[PDB]
């Protein structure tokens, strides 16, 4: 058993807006764009120490 999350329609819309806002911060207007810029080195990451994850 699990908790009632409501209608999957409202949740899918929430995820959609989530992805759009994450893409905006990353600086690309497309996830096709993000994936390509990742392969090119124009989208960059940063590994986080375990301490950095706690905070």
């Amino acid at each position: 058993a699990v908790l009632d999350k409501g209608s999957v329609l409202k949740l899918l819309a929430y995820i959609h807006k989530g992805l759009q806002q994450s893409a905006q911060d990353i600086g690309e207007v497309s996830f096709d764009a993000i994936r390509e810029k990742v392969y090119e080195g124009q989208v960059l990451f940063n590994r986080r120490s375990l301490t950095a994850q706690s905070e």
């Binding site: 908790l3 999350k5 409501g6 409202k10 929430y14």
Partner: peptide, 9 residues
Amino acid sequence: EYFFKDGMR
């Protein structure tokens, strides 16, 4: 209003 805090509605 409804919101999603942590895997919860």
